[PDB]
Design a binder for these strands. Sequence first.
RNA 1: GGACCCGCACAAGCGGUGGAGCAUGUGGUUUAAUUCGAAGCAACGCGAAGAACCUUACCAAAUCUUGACAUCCUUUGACAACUCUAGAGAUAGAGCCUUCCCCUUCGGGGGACAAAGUGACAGGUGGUGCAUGGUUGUCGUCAGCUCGUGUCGUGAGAUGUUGGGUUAAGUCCCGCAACGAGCGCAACCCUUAAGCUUAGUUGCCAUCAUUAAGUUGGGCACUCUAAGUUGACUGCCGGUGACAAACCGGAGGAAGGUGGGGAUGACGUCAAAUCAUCAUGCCCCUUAUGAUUUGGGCUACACACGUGCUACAAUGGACAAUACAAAGGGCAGCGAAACCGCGAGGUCAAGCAAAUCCCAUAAAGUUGUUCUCAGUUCGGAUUGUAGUCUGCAACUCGACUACAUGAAGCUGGAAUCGCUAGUAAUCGUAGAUCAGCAUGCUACGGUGAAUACGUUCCCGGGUCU
Lengths: 107, 72, 202, 145, 97, 125, 59, 72
Amino acid sequence: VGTKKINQRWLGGLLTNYKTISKRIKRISEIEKMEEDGLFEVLPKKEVVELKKEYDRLIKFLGGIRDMKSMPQALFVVDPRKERNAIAEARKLNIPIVGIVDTNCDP
Amino acid sequence: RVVISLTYIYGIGTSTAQREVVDGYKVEGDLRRETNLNIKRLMYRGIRHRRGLPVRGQKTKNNARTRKGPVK
Amino acid sequence: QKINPIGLRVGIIRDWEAKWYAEKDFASLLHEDLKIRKFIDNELKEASVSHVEIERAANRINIAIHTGKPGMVIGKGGSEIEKLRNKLNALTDKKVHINVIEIKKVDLDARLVAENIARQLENRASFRRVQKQAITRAMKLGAKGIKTQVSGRLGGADIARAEQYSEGTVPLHTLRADIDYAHAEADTTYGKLGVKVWIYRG
Amino acid sequence: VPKRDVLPDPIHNSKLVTKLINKIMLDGKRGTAQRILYSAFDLVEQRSGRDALEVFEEAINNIMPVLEVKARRYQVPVEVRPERRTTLGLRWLVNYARLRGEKTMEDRLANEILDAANNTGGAVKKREDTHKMAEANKAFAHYRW
Amino acid sequence: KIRIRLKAYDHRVIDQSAEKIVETAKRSGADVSGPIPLPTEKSVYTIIRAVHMYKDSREQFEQRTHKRLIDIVNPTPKTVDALMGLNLPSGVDIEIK
Amino acid sequence: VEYRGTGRRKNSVARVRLVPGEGNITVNNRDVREYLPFESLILDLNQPFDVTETKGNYDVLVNVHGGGFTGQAQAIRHGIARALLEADPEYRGSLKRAGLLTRDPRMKERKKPGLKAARRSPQFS
Amino acid sequence: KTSMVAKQQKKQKYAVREYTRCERCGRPHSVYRKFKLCRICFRELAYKGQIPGVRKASW
Amino acid sequence: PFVDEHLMKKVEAQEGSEKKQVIKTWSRRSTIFPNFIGHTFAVYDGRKHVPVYVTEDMVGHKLGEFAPTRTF
RNA sequence: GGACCCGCACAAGCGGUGGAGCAUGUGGUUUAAUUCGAAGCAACGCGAAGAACCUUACCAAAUCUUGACAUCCUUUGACAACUCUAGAGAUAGAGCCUUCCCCUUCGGGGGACAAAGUGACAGGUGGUGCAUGGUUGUCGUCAGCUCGUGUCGUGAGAUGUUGGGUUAAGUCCCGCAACGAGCGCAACCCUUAAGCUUAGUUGCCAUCAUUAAGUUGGGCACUCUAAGUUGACUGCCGGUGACAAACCGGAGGAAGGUGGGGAUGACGUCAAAUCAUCAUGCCCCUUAUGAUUUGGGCUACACACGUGCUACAAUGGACAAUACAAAGGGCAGCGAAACCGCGAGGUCAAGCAAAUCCCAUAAAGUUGUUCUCAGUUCGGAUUGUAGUCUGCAACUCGACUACAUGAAGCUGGAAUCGCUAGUAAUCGUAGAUCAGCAUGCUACGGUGAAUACGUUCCCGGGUCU
């Protein structure tokens, strides 16, 4: 649970803000599923290209998770001074942080 | 011409019939004496000859300045 | 100043409540229909009619009322529609035919819940409780959005407020979107409270 | 802001003469303007014997300024573009034809074109007045806008 | 021929009658010309928007009245009997000439 | 022998026909003397016979109503240009470079109910 | 004012003082005599959809 | 137009003897016919009845420019 | 106070207002009240898209009290209409019965009426929009206003909404404790802009006969008419672009960057407007602040302001001939043709409950004749006479015509308004209200511009600091 610069763009939440980020991963599981019962050209052309942009940004800036069903019990970060908003929630969720110490920050 | 040289002279005007023209109807100031006789016979909408209203109405509300002054 | 979407959508996606051609007479027809609606509004005080659609065919009238409580206009076996049809045959001097239609989702049509918030606010209830129970009982029966605004001397006050409790999508500027609307006055002891219910049934 | 232009009139085939037609029209009447320009050009052809476009091009360059003031808070003699030069020369030609005091507009625009070919009249007086206003404020400013 | 002037307010209820009475005369007759449209000219009512003041904002209400001409040449006894017999528009002006 | 183009601009529709000949525009079969008021400005309607100068030899016979006289003469231009399109399809670039083939959608604009004379706002004091 | 509404629904002494009112309200001015309704009842019954008539402003 | 005088029978009763005092009419729309010269009417000007005397010259005029109500 | 961007907000223009006459509206003043409202933008040709009576509350006089109207009780009851007398009419008084339509045995019941009791009740366009609902202007079609969950801050609050770029846009992309969603922007809606399909009559006349005429024979070719449809979306190419939004240009296309326009006006502000559309809390009058009718009055004038029409002329006035249209209306209504009228209009009357017939000639324009810079051949104000129309009726107080009169006015001071394209200007036409009555309003076409370098400055609004 964590990457280097989960591919990029750690958002403001996704651990302790789960209940409205559950709607995002269920929307990825929605918009993968509703291609097959009729998606193209029963709508206008000016919605399906931003639907493909929503499917691209929900697998690019989210990263690589899809089956995150609840809160994981640990974090595995590499860079703990770029991911300061990632290491600040786990002290409030009572779960330990495991990270490679970079300069002065500690997990 | 002969038609435009008779218009602003009193009596004959613009839509008249046509040195032989020295005769006829009330071309002179006797029509002006007739008009002052009708104004003297009306003096009753002769109480509205000081103001600006005829025998068929005017609605003086904002503009009767033809029978008034500039500022006064 | 927002106009109403029961008026913006006639001739677009919402049909009229008057389906009859008339060319010559017409003001001696339409006012008859207005007097017909001023007989049905009298029964609305109990039996909760939503809207009346008059189908004046050639001489007879196919009046179609849309009530949510249909057992109080139809009687136990057909008596109340027969005395309603005889009083309307007295009061219009044409043939009428009461075609009652039976609607379910009684908390989803805007005349019924606007008249229901009017019957709650005549009984000195609080406006916030009936607004929140109206929008939650209209969302749990299944809709895409309900706005509910009641104006006037709210709670018997002195300064007139106008408070609205909206939830869900109520897209009034989208023209191909079937938005039900009703307003109803409520004659309280401290004046008149005017409700305004805006339901977008998807 | 693209400022699209008009086709040339077919009697004297130039694009400036149709803009002069569009300047001497008043209250939309184009055919009255076509009646008072073409017989005026025939009156300049019958008075001074040469072609009408030749005497019109030697008179429209005498009304055309090269400088103009631009009042601000002051007068800056800024160099003007050739489209503003030709509409200001046409505007001064029509507006100082119209205050001449003669009878018909084929005797009133035509004599003002014949005076502007020989640097006389009130259109070239307006170009000289704009040049005196542009040299009176030349040492004041040449840098503001 | 016989001419009917089939005339309504909205266009949605005039088109079903125009495919109704043409196929009714087609299945029980011969040689019906189709739903000829007329200019369908309207009356526009321009009222002021407000109650007391404010003539600067107004509201416009037009009453469109669509008309379709249907002409039936060489009629049978099956045409005239089923012509006035069949009635489901609920809202148009049927005239028979 | 008959090139039936049509063409409209500004509430004026021209039904032209192109028969081969020397060249004679007959609007409502009369002339171009009594019908069109401008004797000089009938070269608006003689623009596709001068832009596309392969030949200036075409009798246009035309019978249509609508409009005034000037926008009617630009509809004569639009009908002659669409008839020269249907007479020869290699004239299309030669028309299309010099304008002359657009139905220009400038029609007379519709009068606004607040304003006095269709964006002529009635004089705030 | 219901004196004038009951007054104008009566035979008058002249034939040209029989004037026009709205037939549900009592508004004297701007009564459209195609409809015999006033300016506000025509707006209200066109917004409820109980007269045959569309709001369209594309004249 | 055609001169009405709808209350002509109010005058034609009192035509035999001398004219008894004044006669109260409430109609300024009635014209003067030339057979009651000399009669004294009471024209209602809205406020009260003002008496008028029909002398000789007002035989085309109605009873309405006489007894004005515009005052000043 | 700054930065930045945008709107006819200035510049660049074009045409007005303010100067004159007239129409309309308001204030002031006045009468017996000149009905009551609207009051910087956001009042002032507005509610009023119809002031002779009616509308009409206001005002003078004559008048009535459960009443002009609504419901219920009692008696009677198929109501009454039309004539005559008085009166200004409302109304009283006679002539006179229209006199059970559903129905029971005679007496009933009872759609529906008249009178009495004057009983409950009404009635109020009386007051407060600063008690209200409903409806609407306004910033402003400006792009804003917020919420769920999570975070930060002890809090109030902030993040989302900010920073970079772009756009008409909080439009979209990138970066980012934010991720989404709602109302608003954007179309989905209508109209216009091109072709196809469908269908040719009253519409249109290719091809032909034919006539005063597309008016009939024929046909639906084209225009047209309208329900479907395809089409315009930065979708293709090239460059600038962070390789992303976006911009610029070209092809194609009838239409190029929300194509033009309308509808649509977020959260809210102004205790903004409406107790006079209606409904309504409370107060007040209830033989008056209710009611009917006649006659005034809203239609006054020593003035001032706002809107608008007509002019001050030669790019024009007058006269003669001639062309081209869109949109709309019409059953007591639209009034063809023809006759007689100088003319408003009348006599007689075809056709049409509308693509048929009528309003309906549009006018400016074009071609001629004439006038030749004047207070005129400009204007048509004011006033007199004679008329037409509509209406029981033109006096206060209607429109129009004819003849005469021809008053200010020769492009308007400081200042000020509208408008970015079929727009400004100018010219007519049609509707609504309407018995008649517009220079107003709404709507339609004809001819038809010049400009916009810029946005520094004057106002108004938005973003962050």
